[model samples]
Target: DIHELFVPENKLDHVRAEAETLPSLSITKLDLQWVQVLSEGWATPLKGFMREKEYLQVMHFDTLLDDGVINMSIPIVLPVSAEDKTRLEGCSKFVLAHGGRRVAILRDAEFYEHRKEERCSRVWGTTCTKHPHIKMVMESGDWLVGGDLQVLEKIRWNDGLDQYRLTPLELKQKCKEMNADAVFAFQLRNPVHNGHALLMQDTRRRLLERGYKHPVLLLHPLGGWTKDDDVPLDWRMKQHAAVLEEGVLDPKSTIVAIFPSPMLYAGPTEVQWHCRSRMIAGANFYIVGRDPAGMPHPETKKDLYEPTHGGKVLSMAPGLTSVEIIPFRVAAYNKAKKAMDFYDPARHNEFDFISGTRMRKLAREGENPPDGFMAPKAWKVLTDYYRSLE
Candidate 1:
C-alpha cells in the first residue's frame, strides 16, 4: 500500500548510524518537513520531491507520466536557490541536515528548472505574490531537485506536541483498533467550535444510520507552516484536546491527528489533495463543507473559488474513484436558540456565526461566543491564546 512508511522497525538505529557518515547539506525547515512527509507516505506514490517530468505532469495534468497515477493537485518539487546551487555543485548524494541534525538523505539526484510564474498561475490560479503560497514559491530558488529520500528519524518540532503527530500507518492502526468499517476525515486549520463539533457528530450519526458497525471521524488538522494570521498549531491542538475532553465529541469514534502538510489555499484543487491524503490513510469518506481549503483574495477580499465547488470537484475528481464525498450542511448560530445549530432552510436570517472574523475578534478581546456556542474549556484555550499576545 502507498499509505505506509519505511525504516523497518528495529533497523532504524542502523539506518541512523549509516546516515551520520554521509556528507550532509543544509536545507530549509520547509524542505525538512517535506522529507518527513514523503517518507511518512502522506504524499503517497511520490517517494521523493518531483523530477521535471513528474513536476510538469502534475502541474498541468494532475497525474504522473506512468500508469496507476493519482491526482496531485499541488507540485512538490524541492527548489534549490542559485546561491545554494554552488554549495551542492557536484554532490550526487547528500544528507538533508536541519536544526543541527542530519535527518534524511537524497540519492540518485536529478535537478531541473523550477517554472515559478507558470506554476503559480496554474496551481494557484494566480501569479500575484499576494497569495501566500505564491509568495513562497517566488521566494524559492529557480531550480528544483528530485531523488529518493530515506528518513532516518522523525522531524521534531520540540513544541512538546510532536508526540501526537502520527504516521499514516499509525492512523490506520487506530481505525483498526476502533473496529471501524468506515472512516470519515474532516480537515481543518482553525479552532473547532460548537458549529464544527455539531457537524462532526452529524457525520458519524449519518454513517451509523447506514448500518455501519463502527464509524470513526478523523479530526485531522493541518499542522504545518501557514500564513501569518492563521492560528498557531499549538494553540489549535490544545483547543482540540480540550473540546474532546469536554466529551462533546465521542472519544471512541474520533481520531485526532495532524496532517503534516503546508497550506496552499488552493481551494477546490487543494481540497482534492486533502481528500486524497485521507483516502490514502484509510478513510473512505471525506466530510467537506463549503469553500473547503479556500482563502479570500488578498486585495479584493473576495473568495478565490466558487462556494461548494470543492464538493463538486471531489464528486468527480480523478484518482478518487474509491473515495466517497460526504457533503455537510452549513451550520450557524441560530437566532432563536442564540447558539450553534444546523442551517434551517425555513429561515436564513436566524443563522449567525457565519465567519471566523467575529469569532476571532471575540477571542482577541478575551471574550467567548454565546452559551453553547463552544465548550468553555475550548473557548478558554482560545481566549488564553489571544490574551498572551499583548
Candidate 2:
C-alpha cells in the first residue's frame, strides 16, 4: 500500500490555518467531484487511494494548509536489501520515530480544494490552475486494473512503446557508450541563461581538474509545473536543442533528459528532496544553484533559499554514497576573462541580477537582457514564449 509517511492530527489545525492566510484563487470544485467519483468505485476504494504514492503527492498539498511550517523533508522509505537492512536497522528506527509525518488527514474536502486552485495557476494552457485530481491520479502512483496493477509492473519501464523518452538506465548506458565515467546533473524550469552556462562550465572544469574521466553533462529539466511565467516544456526542450546546436556544452560529453517531477516551491527543504530523489533516479552529482528552489522569506524580503547552503544540506543528509552533492559559488561572466567566472558575493562588485522575474519582465516588454546575461538561443526561446503570451 506504500504507507511510508505520517501526519499527526494535531498538525491538521496548523495546516488549515496556513491555508486561510494564503490568497485564494478561482477554480471549480472539480477536485471534490473527482474525489467523489473515485470513492464510488468499489474496486478502488477511497482508503486504497489514500494509501498510494499518488495520494502522497496530493497530501503534500496539505502542508500548505498549515501556518506553523511543518517540515516534510522526510523521504519515503525505499525497499532495502537484507544485507543493507541489517546495517541500517538503527538508522531506520531513528527515522521512523523522529522522521516527519507523511500522511495528512483533513476533516473534509475543502482542504484539497485550496491546493487544487493553487496548482491550477502554475501550469500553462489548462483552464484550471488546479488540474483535475483524476489527472494527478494518472500522473502519479500506480493504477489498478482488474486483478493486476499495470502501472506498478511498468515502474521505470521505457521501451519503444512509450512516448519519446529516455529512462535513467538508458541515460547511464549512453554515458558509458560515450566513454564517460560519471555524470553531473542540473535541474531547471527556465530557459538556459549565460549565468547557468557559466555554472555548468565551472562544474565541468572542476571535474576535469580532479582528474575525473570525461564526465557527461546531463541537462535534466523539470518538465512539470513551475511557478508562473515558466517557459512551457516543449519550448524549453527546443531551447536546450538550440543551445546544444550552438555548441555551448561539450558535444561529446553531454546528454539532456526530461524530469517530469513538479515543483513544490517549498524552498530549501525541497532542495534536499530534489537531489535525493535525483540520486534515486541515477544522478551521480547535482549542482546547487543559489537560492535553489527559492521562495522569498516572508519576514526578510530576501531569498530564504540560499544556494550556498543547499550543498551543505545535501552533504549532511542521512545518506550520501550514491550522489556526490557538490557546492559551487555562483558563476557570472567576467568581462576581463571574456569567459564565465565564479562570483563570490563577498568578493564581487556587481550582483548578477538575472532573475526569473526580471527575465520574464524584460521579455514581455521586448527589452533585451544585458550582455553576459542569457545565452542567445535561450533568450530567443524565452522571448518568443513571452511574445506569444502577449
Candidate 3:
C-alpha cells in the first residue's frame, strides 16, 4: 500500500497554515456517511499500474482532496498505455454513453491505515482524513472505463484554506495590509517569463483602473513531481525570488510561494480541476494559457487542451465558486508597442510559447534565452536545473 509517498514532512507546516485561513466548503456528516456506505462494497477492475512518473499525478489529486482545497465529487482519469487505453476506453465510453452505474470501493481507510503504520500520518493526514471521498471515488462505478482509472485522494495543501502554508498567508495578509482589493493566483511550472510579467502588469493596471484595489500577484509554482527534463523546483523558486528582488514589478503587490503539489499533465480536464481547485484554495482568479496541463491530443499532435473549453467546463460545474477565469493569449514583447503585448496571430508576429521544453533544450545547449523571454533571475535557476539534470 502506498503511504504518504508524495508529500514531504518539511512542507506540512506550510500546507496546514494555507488550509486554515481559507474558507472551507463545509462537508456534512451525511457526506461522510454516504462515502462510508458507498465505499464499503464498491469495486472496479484496474486497467493497469501507473508508471513511477505518473505517481506525481496521483499525489496532486490527493493533495487537493486531502487539504480541502476542492470538495468536488469525481475521480480524475489519467491517460493510459495503448493496450490499457483500448480496454479502459470501452468501459469509460459505456458509462458516459449509457450513463451506466460506475462503482467505487472505499480503500481510503486501508490507505490511511498503511500511512499510520508508516508513522507518516500527519504528512498524509490531510489526505488521510478525506479517506471517505477516496472511498466514494473508488466506489464510483461498477466497471472502470476509459482513461487510466485511478482513485484520487481527497484533501490538498491549503495554507490559505486550511491555514497550513503560513508563508502564503503572510503574503496574503501582506496584500491585505497593503489595502489590495483583489488577488490573482498565477501557476508556474517553470521560471518567470516576459509573458508572465506582462500578465502581472496588466492584471494590476486593470485593477487600479477599475478603482477597486491594487492587485496582489501571487506566483505559485509547483514544487514536486516534475519530469526529469523539466526545470527543478529549487531553480524555479530562486528565479521567482530573483524577479521580486530585481523589482521588475511592484514588490509590494507581488507574492511568491512554492506549491508542493505534483504535475498531472492531464490536459484540459486536469486544467479545469486545477483552476476549480485553486479557487477553493482561496484564489480569487486564475490565469489559463494555451495548454495548462500540457496534455497533447494524440490525433492532432497539437495541444488538444483548449483553455476556453476547459474554463467553460469548470465555470459550469455545479457548486464551484464564482472565481474569474482570466484567459490571456500568449504574451510577447512587441518592439513596435515598446512594451509587452498579448500574442496576435493576425499580426503573424511569431509568438514563441513559453514552455519548459524550449527552456530545457536551450539549457542543455548552454544557450541563454533571449531577453523578454525569461526573467534574469529565472534564467539562472534554469541554468542550475540544467546542471543538476546532467
Candidate 4:
C-alpha cells in the first residue's frame, strides 16, 4: 500500500499566522481545485506549485524533480499577472487567497514566465483557441509562481453529494475498514451506462481471478470543475446512484466516491496523474480503457491522442511498479448476444453502441436510449435532468 503524505491540520495555525505578513495572490476556480488536491495529498509529494525546472520537466517528460520516483504529468502551477510577479519579487513567502479567504501559504516562492504557445503545444498537444483549457490558460496569467505550500483551509462541498466526496485520507481509511486487499479504481467524468457497468464488473472479476480474494471496485468520479458541455456533477451523481440501485454490480464489493480534482483534458499525460491520485487513495490497481482521458480537436474533430496511448504511457511511468494497470478494449452492447463485449470491427453490424453525443441529443429530444445501451433507471435520471434544464 502506498502511504499518503498528507499535510497535518495542526500546521494551519503557524501557516495562518505567517501568511498575514506576506504578499497575497488570489486564485481562480481551476487554481482552487489544484490547491485542494495538492493540500489533501491526492497529488502526493506535491505540496505546492511546481518550480520552473519541474514545470518544464513535467510538460516535456511527465515527471517531477527527477525521473522515476515522483510521477506527475500535468503541471500544477499558480499563474500570476505581471504586476503580481513584481509585487512578489522581494518576498520569500506569500499567501494564496480565494474568494477573499486565505487558503494556502507559499514558502520560498520562485517566479518564472512560461511560453504559453510552447506550454499549450507540449502539454495539451494543441494551441488552438477552440480547446477549452487552452483558451483558459492563454487568457489567465502571464507569470507562474512555484514554492512549498502550507494549506490553511480545506475545501467543503455542500452540493448534495458531500458525503460521497472523500479526500485521499478518508478514502484510504475506508478501504482499510472494508478490508480490501486490492482496490481497482475507475475514473469517470460522465454518467454510468451499461457499457461502463460491464467494464467495472469485468475489471473486478479479473482482479479476483488474479488472486485478489478481497478485491473491491472503487467508482471514483471527478467532482470538480469540468468542461462546460459535461453533465453537472449533481446529475452525474444521481445517475451513478441509479445504476447502483439497479444492481449494476454487487454492492458489497463496490465503493462509489467522488474525486474532487478538476479535469485537465490533458489526454495521455492526465492518465498518469489520475492513477497517481488513486494510488494515494490506497488503490492497488487502475482500469484504463480506450483513449483514457482523451480529447478531440475542436475544428477537425480528430482524436488528440492515439488509442491506447494512456495505458501505454502509464506502463512506462516511474513509481507505479506496485500499482497494476488493467487496460480494457472499449466495450459496446452486442445486439445479437444481448451483452456487452469488446468492440469488434468485424462484427460492427451486430453491435449497438450509443455515442455520448448521440445520447445527449436523444435525451435533449426527450427520447430514451436504445435497449441495452443504458439501464432504464440511469437513462431516466439523465433524461429527467435534461428535461429540467429545458
lDDT of each: 0.82, 0.50, 0.48, 0.81
Regions more than 4 Å wrong, model 3? 1-178, 297-301, 315-317, 333-339, 350-358, 364-366
Name the runs in model 2 displaced over 4 angstroms: 1-164, 297-307, 333-340, 346-348
Question: For residues 231-322, what per-residue lDDT tens digits would candidate 3 score against the true structure?
Answer: 66656666777777777766777766655444545554556545644553456877776556564444455664564555555545443455
**Runs in model 1 with CA error above 4 Å?**
3-23, 65-67, 86-89, 344-346, 364-366
Q: Can you write out model 1's per-residue Cα lDDT over 135-235, one digit (the tens) per residue?
A: 98899898888887777766668878777788888888989999889999989998998888888888888888999989988999998778888889989
**Clashes per model (N, Cα, C within 3 A):** 0, 11, 56, 0
Cα-based RMSD of the predictions, in order? 2.2, 15.2, 14.9, 2.0
Could you tell me which 10 consecutive residues in candidate 2 have the lowest summed lDDT? 145-154
What 10-residue stretch in candidate 3 is worst by lDDT? 105-114
lDDT of 2 by residue, 112-142 (tens): 1113333323221122213232244233312
Once model 4 is optimally superposed onto the true structure by TM-score, how far is the C-alpha of residue 153 displaced, in angstroms? 2.4
Residue 355 lDDT in model 4? Answer: 83
Q: How close is candidate 4 to the true structure, as a TM-score?
A: 0.94
lDDT of 3: 0.48
Q: Return the top candidate by TM-score.
A: 4
TM-scores for every predicted model: 0.93, 0.59, 0.56, 0.94
lDDT digits (tens) for residues 278-358 of candidate 4: 987878888888888888878789888897788888877886766888888888888887777788987789777788888
How many pairs of residues collide in model 3? 56
Full candidate order by TM-score, most accurate first: 4, 1, 2, 3
